[PDB]
Design a protein around this ligand. Structure first.
Ligand code: CHL
Ligand code: CLA
Ligand code: CLA
Ligand code: CLA
Ligand code: CLA
Ligand code: CLA
Ligand code: CLA
Ligand SMILES: CCCCCCCCCCCCCCCCCC(=O)OC[C@H](COP(=O)(O)O)OC(=O)CCCCCCCCCCCCCCCCC
Ligand SMILES: CC(/C=C/C=C(C)/C=C/[C@@]12O[C@]1(C)C[C@@H](O)CC2(C)C)=C\C=C\C=C(C)\C=C\C=C(C)\C=C\[C@@]12O[C@]1(C)C[C@@H](O)CC2(C)C
Ligand SMILES: CC1=C(/C=C/C(C)=C/C=C/C(C)=C/C=C/C=C(C)/C=C/C=C(C)/C=C/C2=C(C)C[C@H](O)CC2(C)C)C(C)(C)C[C@H](O)C1
Ligand SMILES: CC1=C[C@H](O)CC(C)(C)[C@H]1/C=C/C(C)=C/C=C/C(C)=C/C=C/C=C(C)/C=C/C=C(C)/C=C/C1=C(C)C[C@H](O)CC1(C)C
Lengths: 221, 231, 41, 219, 207
């Protein structure tokens, strides 16, 4: 059929993970998405995590590249405290509350999309926020929300092959970005520098700058 | 067989049988796949071409007549007959009028064609983005050929203006000054000489335009696009 | 999954989970607001 | 039925139909499943909303008029003591008993309305005034001697519109009065004092800086 | 559509042509309810007529203040007019105005509730009546030819005057002096004297 996370071994989870979802390679060895309702929830979660991690990793990469040209930008792991210091008139509680309230508005919008797939493209919002559907055969809603506002440049309207290709690009880059952010957190814990700092340290001397030499991974060396 | 952006290649599909001028079958990313977006992007390209033509011509002439003024910094070092606040407000109002009219005209063709003040005056029917009439007094040659000529020149002008900006960032002098600097030593002024990266070292050119500037008290964060990302 | 969540809804597991949650909550309240003898408002 | 709801996408419960004024399908706690309880809650909401509109008016309007420079009345929290210390002031206990004795009569009348919405109109009740208590078929909307100007007393749907305006304003007033109470308990300043304070430094002066809202123990 | 080309008249303003100065301008649909629009037309007429009166008063009295013709009465700023003594104190003037306007505005309101029922005076004098907001007060009868054109002139000048009064108060709070004083101040440069450079309006600039 398609490519599997394990060539051969067709004992991939029973056909709730057939070659239908975008990014589907039969990887569910722990069965966390077996039932269809949980599978739909997991598809939403994976796309959202991929997009959010893509945003976060791009921000971390750029902020760590600026922090190497000497620009007055802190590293990603100290940006919160650095900002709180440099802007003393702001209250942590206020910023945390505002972030939770403004994030909450849009996340309730997305929640009531998940509950009723087409219910959010009406009332105050126009009709483009109704969603184009996608996975599980739904033709409305979903993690893919077309229209002229979330897809302003029309890069998935027209040419179904092009839409599928771009969907695959998004999903694979999202999985890569999630793995990359896990790497960022692990490298920061083990070494204590930025991501670009670690990359240039490694390329400057490829040896003696592996994970063995940081003294935290291989704990005894 | 026909004119191609890459001889030997085939056109996509939307770009096959264009009615837009300058169709050389580009779009390696599929932005013109849609057909409303294709017309919107065609108008955007035309206005970008014309604004960049005006910009590059103005920069060239201003450099020719006033070589002691850096075009990049000339916004703040020029001595305006008026103020800068009211000048920008006048700019804002006039451009709002004309640009809103043009944008609407593109949105719906048979619309922004009638003079408000004088009822009798009215633009004769035109294709989008080519008003003609009062806007086109003299027409030197066949219209389609001249549209192709305009599109070619506009492409070259937009590339030239981005080059102007970049040379101003890295070299710090006006375009013809940079050309004279490259012509006295062609081997040594190229970006390959000024900047280079290898595994273990990165040599990047400094930005001649300073980090900040002073203008009537306030400071405008005018740096160098994105330093550190330069090769 | 469905059967695993059904198992997590069983009285032996859900009761134990709820007792653990309530115990943890009382422990947290007493950790942050200790030695409270009266309802001082 | 197809009206806007408190949460777009969440359907209204099958007991909050769409007939009551101010109906947005908001009832997460399912307090109004019983029809009789729903009528009593409607009537309670009307009373709370009307008293809160009166109270919030008598709080902000004197406060804002004092601010600009007129009437110079105290701030609402201390206004009880400001009068209480006056010379010819009625004692608190006697004053409260006078108020409660009058409101006993008035509120038991309104109560006997709420039960059978034509109760108090029986002839022989008052001294010829009993006709003004006939009601208007719905509890909480007396009319008659009440509503002297006859506003909405015309097109039915006009009365329905004014009912939504009244209920929305009352809900706003009750939310605002809860705000006044919680703000004066935390920051011992007035409502306009808090307003003019927050606009000064919105990121510094808010509810996460007074130290009473967020528990000091936690932080 | 008239107020903004390529837009669309909001239906309730579309076929309703018997309104003065109808241009389809209603981005907020306050007038969707027909009774609401019937009230809002009267509100617009009252606001426009009172603002034409008020702005004419402001401009004429301040022009007299600047040039100098009306004496100690008019040699004050319009907003500082409460310092003049007059034949009465402020309080009795306010009381008299309450009484008189109660009379006049209740006559107009009774006209509104049942149009045409209140035209006759206690002495039997009977005036005519045409349209709701236009009681036919025509001593010189400028209303027999092109009446819609005259209503258009009235309403357009009324909208201009309400805009003018909003400008008067906004400028008075923003910059000091009489309105025409400010007009001369703008005409002085003008590229620096404009709403941007006050320290009161953008706020983004100079705190
Ligand atoms: C705040 C808005 C408000 C609105 C929109 C209404 C609307 C309504 N009330 Mg109502 N009320 C409001 C407040 C209050 N009412 C009452 C007490 C009653 C009674 C007892 C009755 C009504 C009735 C009515 C209806 C018709 C008469 C009326 O009031 O017309 C609308 C009038 C206005 C909106 C005028 C408000 C403007 C101005 C006077 C405010 C002044 C504020 C100052 C600072 C003081 C109508 C649905 C009658 C009804 O339902 O008959 C069938 C009726 O019998 N109301 C109280 C208690 C003091 C209120 C307190 O805020
Ligand atoms: C939270 C992120 C996330 C989520 C919600 C999903 C969700 C999904 N993935 Mg997926 N994936 C992810 C990240 C994620 N993925 C990453 C980072 C990679 C790169 C390695 C992949 C690679 C991948 C492949 C190749 C495939 C999937 C597939 C699927 C779908 C079927 C499997 C399933 O439902 O299990 C649900 C998974 C979870 C509920 C996540 C649970 C994670 C556990 C509880 C924690 C342990 C993980 C981690 C190592 C622990 C680190 C924590 C600590 C060390 C800090 C499903 C909708 C299959 C598919 O067909 O897609 C349609 C499939 O082919 N994923
Ligand atoms: C060399 C660039 C170039 C070319 C080849 C064209 C060509 C054309 N333009 Mg265009 N235009 C340009 C630049 C150009 N334009 C710029 C920069 C602007 C912005 C100011 C405009 C704004 C514009 C508008 C608003 C309109 C056109 C129109 C047209 C078309 C018919 C009118 C005409 O023939 O004009 C004549 C061609 C030229 C004048 C090219 C000569 C270049 C000059 C002489 C150099 C400047 C000299 C200066 C002293 C240095 C035609 C195909 C009209 C149209 O589409 O008709 C339906 C239309 O309404 N143009
Ligand atoms: C139900 C709402 C409500 C309530 C409970 C109160 C309560 C109070 N108001 Mg208030 N007020 C309200 C609404 C309300 N007001 C509204 C809507 C306004 C208009 C904006 C005002 C404007 C107002 C002003 C200007 C003042 C008060 C004052 C007072 C306080 C003294 C009352 C008094 O002097 O004796 C009781 C009131 C009587 C009328 C006694 C009755 C005696 C006569 C003979 C019978 C009736 C005629 C008191 C705590 C005074 C104050 O500040 O306290 C120091 C004060 O000066 N109020
Ligand atoms: C308080 C003054 C006032 C009032 C009551 C009205 C009322 C009306 N206008 Mg008018 N208008 C006004 C001021 C006013 N206008 C001014 C100053 C201008 C010049 C900018 C205009 C220009 C104008 C046009 C071009 C048109 C109308 C039209 C209308 C009618 C339909 C619009 C509507 O229903 O919304 C009701 C509007 C209000 C209830 C005003 C609310 C006041 C808020 C608080 C203003 C907000 C503050 C401000 C932004 C600062 C309606 C009867 C349309 C019509 O059909 O004419 C009959 C139409 O074509 N108006
Ligand atoms: C721009 C000002 C203006 C204009 C064009 C109109 C126009 C009109 N009015 Mg109106 N009116 C105005 C101001 C204006 N009015 C003001 C400020 C008030 C409040 C006092 C009124 C009160 C009013 C009433 C009560 C009535 C009218 C009526 C009418 C209509 C017929 C009468 C007429 O044509 O008189 C012509 C108007 C002029 C020639 C304007 C010149 C007057 C000069 C400029 C005054 C200079 C002195 C001033 C105080 C300064 C007509 C369309 C009557 C009507 O609707 O008929 C059916 C109607 O009953 N008006
Ligand atoms: C009724 C028409 C009208 C006219 C003819 C003027 C004219 C003038 N105004 Mg003004 N203004 C108006 C309405 C008007 N205004 C309204 C309705 C407002 C409330 C938003 C303002 C608020 C305002 C401020 C805060 C200031 C002026 C100022 C001025 C003067 C300089 C221009 C300027 O910067 O203003 C700006 C005008 C606008 C932002 C929009 C005006 C509304 C329409 C589009 C006018 C046509 C000038 C003589 C400035 C001054 O004091 O002079 C030095 C100044 O500080 N105006
Ligand atoms: C950790 C356990 C979390 C289990 C999550 C739900 C499991 C459901 C499931 O796997 O379906 C059974 C699954 C078949 O799916 P079903 O038909 O939906 O029941 O059975 C299997 O193929 C393997 C069962 C083993 C499940 C993992 C056991 C824990 C592995 C780690 C060992 C420690
Ligand atoms: C959300 C996310 C990252 C988001 C990052 C953000 C917002 C960063 C934000 C900021 O940085 C900025 C921008 C600026 C900084 O100054 C401040 C912070 C605040 C730091 C990554 C998730 C990262 C999530 C990761 C890495 C998840 C890995 C999951 C795996 C591997 C699961 C695999 C399997 O689940 C399957 C698929 C099938 C199962 O059956 C079996 C197993 C094996 C369980
Ligand atoms: C369930 C779930 C989530 C959350 C869902 C929730 C819980 C939504 C609702 C959230 C609410 C109501 C959050 C309220 C937060 C209030 C906060 C965070 C107050 C913070 C202030 C603090 C901690 C103290 C600040 C001080 C500072 C440092 C200075 C002094 O002056 C003193 C002091 C006041 C102590 C997230 C993670 C968001 C996503 C979703 O996917 C899963
Ligand atoms: C709906 C629902 C349903 C679902 O299901 C569930 C839930 C969620 C629960 C819900 C909600 C609820 C809520 C929100 C509530 C709130 C309320 C309020 C706030 C009230 C007040 C209310 C309020 C009120 C009455 C008030 C009143 C007031 C007053 C009189 C005042 C008085 C005064 C004055 C003038 C002044 C002086 O000097 C003082 C005094 C003496 C003080």
């Amino acid at each position: 059929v398609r490519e599997l996370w394990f060539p051969g071994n067709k004992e991939v989870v029973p056909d709730y993970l057939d070659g239908s979802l975008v990014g589907d390679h039969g990887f569910d060895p722990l069965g966390l998405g077996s039932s269809p309702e949980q599978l739909s929830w997991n598809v939403h979660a994976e796309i959202f995590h991929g997009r959010l991690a893509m945003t976060g990793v791009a921000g971390i990469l750029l902020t760590s590249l600026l922090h190497k040209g000497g620009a007055d930008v802190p590293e990603w792991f100290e940006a919160g405290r650095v900002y709180l210091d440099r802007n003393p008139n702001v209250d942590f509680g206020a910023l945390l509350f505002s972030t939770i309230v403004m994030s909450g508005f849009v996340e309730f919008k997305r929640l009531n999309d998940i509950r009723n797939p087409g219910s959010q493209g009406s009332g105050i919002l126009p009709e483009d926020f109704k969603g184009v559907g996608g996975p599980q055969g739904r033709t409305v809603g979903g993690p893919y929300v077309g229209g002229r506002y979330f897809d302003p440049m029309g890069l998935c309207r027209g040419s179904p092959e092009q839409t599928l290709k771009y969907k695959w690009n998004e999903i694979r880059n999202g999985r890569l970005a999630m793995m990359a952010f896990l790497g960022f957190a692990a490298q920061y814990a083990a070494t204590g520098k930025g991501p670009i700092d670690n990359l240039v340290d490694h390329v400057a001397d490829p040896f003696h700058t592996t994970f063995v030499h940081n003294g935290v991974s291989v704990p005894f060396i | 067989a026909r004119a191609n952006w890459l001889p030997g290649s085939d056109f996509p599909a939307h770009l096959e049988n264009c009615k837009l001028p300058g169709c050389y079958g580009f779009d390696p990313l599929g932005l013109g796949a849609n057909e409303e977006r294709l017309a919107w992007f065609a108008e955007s390209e035309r206005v970008h071409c014309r604004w960049a033509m005006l910009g590059v011509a103005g920069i060239l002439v201003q450099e020719i007549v006033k070589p002691d003024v850096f075009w990049y910094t000339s916004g703040a070092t020029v001595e305006l007959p008026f103020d800068i606040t009211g000048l920008l407000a006048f700019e804002l109002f006039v451009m709002h009028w004309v640009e809103s009219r043009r944008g609407y005209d593109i949105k719906k063709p048979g619309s922004m064609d009638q003079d408000p003040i004088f009822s009798n005056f009215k633009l004769p029917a035109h294709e989008p983005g080519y008003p003609g009439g009062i806007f086109a007094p003299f027409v030197p040659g066949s219209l389609e050929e001249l549209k192709v000529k305009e599109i070619k020149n506009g492409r070259l002008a937009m590339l030239a203006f981005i080059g102007f900006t970049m040379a101003a960032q890295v070299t710090g002098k006006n375009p013809l000054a940079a050309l004279r600097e490259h012509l006295d030593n062609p081997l040594g002024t190229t970006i390959f000489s000024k900047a280079v990266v290898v595994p273990g070292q990165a040599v990047v050119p400094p930005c001649a335009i300073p980090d900040t500037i002073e203008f009537q008290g306030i400071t405008i964060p005018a740096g160098c696009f994105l330093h550190s990302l330069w090769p | 999954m469905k059967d695993f969540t059904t198992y997590l809804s069983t009285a032996p597991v859900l009761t134990l989970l709820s007792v653990t949650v309530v115990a943890g909550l009382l422990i947290e309240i007493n950790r942050f607001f200790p030695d409270a003898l009266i309802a001082a408002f | 039925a197809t009206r806007p709801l408190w949460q777009p996408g969440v359907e209204a419960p099958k007991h909050l139909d769409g007939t009551m004024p101010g109906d947005f399908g908001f009832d997460p706690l399912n307090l109004g499943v019983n029809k009789e309880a729903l009528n009593w809650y409607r009537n309670a909401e009307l009373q709370n909303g009307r008293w809160a509109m009166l109270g919030v008016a008598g709080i902000v309007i004197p406060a804002e008029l004092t601010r600009v420079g007129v009437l110079n009345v105290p701030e609402w929290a201390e206004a009880g003591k400001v009068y209480a210390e006056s010379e010819n002031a009625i004692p608190f206990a006697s004053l409260l008993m006078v108020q409660l004795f009058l409101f006993n009569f008035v509120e038991i009348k309104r109560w006997e309305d709420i039960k059978k919405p034509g109760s108090q109109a029986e002839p022989g009740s008052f001294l010829g005034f009993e006709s003004g208590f006939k009601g208007t078929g719905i509890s909480g909307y007396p009319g008659g001697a009440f509503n002297p100007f006859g506003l909405g007393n015309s097109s039915k749907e006009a009365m329905d519109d004014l009912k939504w305006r009244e209920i929305r304003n009352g809900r706003l007033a009750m939310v605002a009065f809860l705000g006044f109470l919680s703000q004066h308990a935390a920051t011992g300043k007035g409502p306009l004092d808090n307003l003019a304070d927050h606009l000064a430094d919105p990121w510094g002066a808010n509810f996460c800086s007074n130290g009473v809202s967020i528990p000091s123990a936690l932080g | 559509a008239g107020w903004d080309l390529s837009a669309e008249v909001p239906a309730h303003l579309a076929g309703r042509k018997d309104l003065a100065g109808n241009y389809g301008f209603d981005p907020l649909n306050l007038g969707k309810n027909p009774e609401a629009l019937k009230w809002y037309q009267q509100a617009e007429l009252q606001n426009g007529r009172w603002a034409m009166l008020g702005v004419a008063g402001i401009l004429v009295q301040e022009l007299l203040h600047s040039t100098g013709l009306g004496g100690k009465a008019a040699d004050v700023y319009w907003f500082d007019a409460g310092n003049n003594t007059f034949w009465a104190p402020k309080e009795t003037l306010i009381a008299i105005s309450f009484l008189m306007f109660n009379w006049a505005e209740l006559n107009r309101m009774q006209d509104y509730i049942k149009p045409g029922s209140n035209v006759t005076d206690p002495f039997g004098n009977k005036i005519k009546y045409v349209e709701l907001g236009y009681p036919g007060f025509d001593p010189l009868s400028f209303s027999k030819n092109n009446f819609d054109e005259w209503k258009l002139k009235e309403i357009k000048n009324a909208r201009l005057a309400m805009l003018a009064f909003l400008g008067i108060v906004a400028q008075h709070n923003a910059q000091p002096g009489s309105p025409l004083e400010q007009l001369g101040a703008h005409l002085a440069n003008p590229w620096k004297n404009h709403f941007i450079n006050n320290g009161v309006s953008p706020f983004l600039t100079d705190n």
